[model samples]
Target: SPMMPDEIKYEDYRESLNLPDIVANGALPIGLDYEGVTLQKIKLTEPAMISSENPREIAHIAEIMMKEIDILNEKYAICIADSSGEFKAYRHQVANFAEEREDIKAIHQLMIEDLKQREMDGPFEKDSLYIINDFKTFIDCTYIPEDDVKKLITKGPELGLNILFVGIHKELIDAYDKQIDVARKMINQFSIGIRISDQQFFQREPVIKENEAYMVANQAYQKIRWFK
Candidate 1:
C-alpha cells in the first residue's frame, strides 16, 4: 500500500520549505509539533532557506554557534532531540536546545510535570523520605561557600513547606547523583535552546504557529509517567 500523508517525511516536504543548505550540520532534528509528528531527512545537496538575506550574516551566526558548542563541551554533557518528539541525553546534562528553540516548551513542562507527578504518586512517599535525609545534611552544613547552595538552603523553609504540603513521614536517603542529574537536565535543556534561538531567528517567526505547537505538545507531554 502507498504511504499516508501523515507518513510522509519532512524531507519529502522540504521542497516546499525555504530551508537553507547549511542546516545539514544538524545531526539531530527534533520534530516541532506536539500532535502527530512525521519525520524525514533529505539530501545535504538541497538548498537552504536563509532567514538572513546575506551569506556573511549566516557565517556570523555559524561562528557564534561554534562558540556555544565550545562552551557546552567544556561545562557539561549533550543531548539530541529525535524526530519522534523525544529527547535523548548523551550524558546527564541540561537541555541544550533551549538555546535554539522554544517550540519545545513541552519538554520542560513535561519534566516539571514529572516532578509534580512523582510528588503525588507512590514515588512521592519515597521521595519525601529522600528529601528528609537530604534536608538533614542540607541543614547541618554550617558553611556552604557557594551563593547558589546557600540560597537553596535559605529557601529551606519553603522546602519544608513542600514536605508539609505532601506530608512527609520517613527519612530521605542520599540521592545526590539522581537529584543533580534532574537539575542538570533542566538547566541544559533551557540553556542550549536559548543558544539556538539566538543563533536562529525564532523570535521573528509567526507566534500563532509557535504557540499552537507548544499547546498541543505540552498536552500530550503531561500524560507521560516519570521513571519509577
Candidate 2:
C-alpha cells in the first residue's frame, strides 16, 4: 500500500505522542472527548409516526423526560444554576410539586438555551454534564414553542451538551422536515452520529444504519480518538 501523507499518518503520530500500541489499532467504538469527557455515541431513538404525532403521546413523553431530569438532578447532582432570577424562581415553583408541571419543563428548556450562549464563553465545567433525553419531544409538533425549538435545533450542539432525542423517524425527518432539517444539518455538518432504534419491533432494537450520517460521524470519531 502507498504511504499516507506525513500529516495524516496515524502510526507515526501516535508514536510521537507515545500513545499505546492499541491506540493506533482499529478495534474501538468511536468517541469524541471534550473537556476530558468522552462521548462515544450520540444516539437518537425514533418511534413510529402514529405515536410521535399525537398530543397525548407528547405529554407522556414530557412526563418521562421530567422524571429522568429529576432523577439526574437528585443522583448525579446535575444542578442548573440560572443566574437569571426568573429561572431560579421557576425552579422553586416546581420544587414542591411531584408531578410534571409546565414551570418545571420551562426551566429545563431555559437552561438548555442558556447553555448554548454560555458555551461561546468557554468549555463546560467538569461538573456540568447535562445529558438531555427524548429531545425530539421537546421540539416536535410544538410540544415546546416553535421558536424555542428552532433555537435549540440551530444551536443546541454548540452548547457542548449530550442530547438524546427519541421519536418516530419519518416524523422528525419527513413530517417535520424543515423544522428538523436543522437537526439533520447539525449532525451532518458536524459529523455527529445518530443511533437509530426499531421502536416497532423487538423492544427498540438498536442497529447502526449504513448511512452517510453514521459514516461521517464515525470518521470524526476516529480522528478524535487518534488525536486524543
Candidate 3:
C-alpha cells in the first residue's frame, strides 16, 4: 500500500516561490486610503545635480514654497493668526519684500526670525511651526548669504529641512561636487538634498519624492487614528 503523502507544507510552499517579504507576511500592497485620498510610498533617489544657472529653478521652487506657505497659513490660521498676533503681522512684512523683489536677504532673515520668535515667544506647537520651519528652510537654502551656502548645503538636515542646493556659480562646480559628496554620505540620516545647477534654471523635478511619500503615510496615519 502507498503511504499517504504528508500534508502539503503550505508555509514552505509559499516560501519556495520567493515572494516579496511583504506579500509573504500576508500584508496587502493596498495601503490604507483616507479622506478619499489614495496614499503612496514615493521614495527619494540620489540628489539631482543640474549644471545650470536657470532662473526658472529659483522661480519654480520659490513658487512652490510660496504656495505651501499659503496653505500652511490657512491651516494654522486659528493657531498662529490668533495666538501671538505677530505671526500674521510678520507675514505681511515678508509679503512686502516678496513684492518688491529686492532685499531678499532681509526677507529671508525676517522669516527666519519670525519662526525663531514663534518658537520662543509663543512656543508655537509642532503642528503649526513645523511647516513654518519648512518655509523658513526653503528661504534659507535659496536666498541666504552665499558665504554660508556651502555649509548649509552640507549640513541642512540638522535643521530638519533639507535643500536641493542649486549652485548658480560656474566657477564653483568643483566645490559643489565636493560638498555634495559629503552630503551623500550622511544622506539617510537627514532630510536634505544638495544639487548643483550651473545655469539660470534647471528643469523642475521632485528631488523629495520620498518626503512626499512620508507625507502620505503621515496623512493616512493621522486619518486612521482620528477615525479610530
Candidate 4:
C-alpha cells in the first residue's frame, strides 16, 4: 500500500514516534494480562469530590497534599535527574504519603486544565504552556486536568517545578519524540487477552447489570484514583 502524505498522516506520525498507531498498526494485539502482575487498582476511599467542588474543601485538600508530599519526599525515592536537566520525580516518590498520591493525579489534572483555559481565554496569558505530548496519559488515568498540562508544556521547564510523569501511557512517549532521547523500553509482555471468555467468564456471574456495572466501575475508579 502507498503511504499517506506526511503532514496529514496522524497515525503514521504517531507510529514513527512510538505512540499507539491503532489505525495503522491495527490495534495492539491484546493478549493475556500485562505480565500477570496487575498493579492493584488504587482506591479513592476518601473525599476526592469535595476537593473539586468546595473552595473550603480545596484549601484543606491542598494542605493535605502539601503535607503528604512533604512526608513522601522524606521517605521515598526521588526519580534520578534527566540529561536535559529535567528532573524526574517518581510518582510514588512524590506521592510519598496519601496526599502525595493524590497530588500526582491531581496535579496532572490541574496542569491539563491550565492549558485548556489558556487556549480558550480571550487574551493569552503572558506565560502559556503547550504540552503537545502526554495527551494520552492525560486521557487514560482517572483524570488529568487539561489546562495545567498545557500550561506546563507551553512553559517548557521554565516554571521550575521540574517534575515529569512517566508510565505505561502512550501520550507521554509521543510528547517528547523529537528529542531523540525518549526511548520506551521494548518488551514482549504477556497479557490475558480480552476475549469473550475473559470478559464473560473471568469471574463469577455479576451481581450487577450493565448500567450498574458501569456505575460501580466509575465509582470505584473515582474513589480509588482521586485524592480526598
Q: Please give the TM-score that candidate 3 achieves against the real structure.
A: 0.28
Angstrom error of the Cα, residue 133, model 1: value is 32
Query: Which residue pairs in candidate 2 collide?
Result: 46-167, 47-167, 47-168
lDDT of 1 by residue, 87-179 (tens): 222213433332123423333343334334554552321111011112223223322223332333233222221111000011111123333
- As a whole number from 0 to 100, the lDDT of residue 39 in candidate 4 is 17
**2 or 4: which has the higher TM-score?**
2
RMSD of 2: 13.7
Worst 10 residues of 1 by lDDT: 163-172
Best model per lDDT? 2
Error of 3 at 165 (Å): 8.2
Instruction: Give the better candidate number (2 or 4) by lDDT.
Output: 2
Which ranges of candidate 1 are over 4 A from the true structure? 1-4, 21-28, 32-185, 188-228
| Of candidates 4 and 3, the better by TM-score | 3
Tens digits of lDDT, candidate 4, 55-119: 23323222322333343343222222111111223234432211223433554555445445544
Q: What TM-score, to 2 decimals, does candidate 1 have?
A: 0.19
Write down the RMSD of all candidates, one decimal each. 20.8, 13.7, 16.6, 19.3
Q: What is the C-alpha lDDT of each candidate?
A: 0.24, 0.34, 0.29, 0.26
Give all TM-scores, in the order shown: 0.19, 0.35, 0.28, 0.22
